[PDB]
């Protein structure tokens, strides 16, 4: 399918397409709360590799953790 096409993209974080899109969500999450729920995985290829099955009962939470 297309997941392998997404797989080698996410390994290109220094590229301009990723360097942009990473800084958008990083800006976007930084205006949100410290602990909240996301409706769907923003990184779906890494989800199913870790065992995420898109069905009722799978809930994900996107949080921010202090650097350092």
């Amino acid at each position: 399918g297309a997941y392998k096409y997404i797989q080698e993209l996410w390994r290109k974080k220094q590229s301009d397409v990723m360097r942009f899109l990473l800084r958008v969500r990083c800006w976007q999450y930084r205006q949100l709360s410290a602990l909240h729920r996301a409706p769907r995985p923003t990184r779906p290829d890494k989800a199913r590799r870790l065992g995420y099955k898109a069905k009722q009962g799978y809930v994900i939470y996107r949080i921010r953790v202090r650097r350092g």
């Binding site: 399918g1 297309a2 397409v17 958008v24 949100l32 923003t42 990184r43």
Partner: protein, 233 residues
């Protein structure tokens, strides 16, 4: 005839003269925490230099050809849970006493058959939240010689099937009468997307300033250019 008791009483809303009436205030509303986040994300899609591999998703197909293509796609809709049920009762009744070409929803169905070159036209949604799930596909069908068109909105594209959203829909084969209906479309589509591949690569997106700043920078471009014009004579 007229009652002379009716006196005209205008109100001078001068500075410190009369109370202000209930005019509009939509531009100064303290918007909620989620809406204020929701709007300036469209600003950041105009401020920064958007890279051209995702800038190509504001370069979308027009109004009137989206009508015909969905009219062309209002004929190959998938069998529902009923149209499967009314398919299976039809095959099981012939057990006691070939498929038409239908579409393919989802990228996992599409990206396989483009590699097998089985597709004849690809329909694309432009406003997926992880844009990375689509970004490879326009640059892929160029290398596969498959015509692709982008459509604004995934929901109106999501109603070809009876689901919410659909990212990608494929036209793999058609009926016999529906051959000249697409052969003119590809001739009108590949002259926007595939043969004009090189010109999309050098066209970055965004890089727009503000209407309170382009009012500022240009006003000094107007005051400087009105100086140097009369310096000659």
């Amino acid at each position: 005839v007229v009652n002379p008791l009716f006196e005209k009483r205008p109100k001078n809303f001068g500075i410190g003269q009369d109370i202000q009436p209930k005019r509009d205030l939509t531009r100064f509303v303290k918007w909620p925490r989620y809406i204020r986040l929701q709007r300036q994300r469209a600003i950041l899609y105009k401020r920064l230099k958007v890279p051209p591999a995702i800038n190509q998703f504001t370069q979308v197909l027009d109004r009137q050809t989206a009508t015909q293509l969905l009219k062309l796609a209002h004929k190959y809709r998938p069998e529902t849970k009923q149209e499967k049920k009314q398919r299976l009762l039809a095959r099981a009744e012939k057990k006691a006493a070939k498929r038409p070409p239908v579409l393919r929803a989802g990228v996992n169905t599409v990206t396989t058959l483009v590699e097998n070159k089985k597709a004849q036209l690809v329909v694309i949604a432009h406003d997926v939240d992880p844009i990375e799930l689509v970004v490879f596909l326009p640059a892929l069908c160029r290398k596969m010689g498959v015509p692709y068109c982008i459509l604004k909105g995934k929901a109106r594209l999501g109603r070809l099937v009876h689901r919410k959203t659909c990212t990608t829909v494929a036209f793999t084969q058609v009926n016999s009468e529906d051959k000249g209906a697409l052969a003119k479309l590809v001739e009108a589509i590949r002259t926007n997307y595939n043969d004009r591949y090189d010109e999309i690569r050098r066209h970055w997106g965004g890089n727009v300033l503000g209407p309170k700043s382009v009012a500022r920078i240009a006003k000094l471009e107007k005051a400087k250019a009105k100086e140097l014009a009369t310096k000659l004579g």
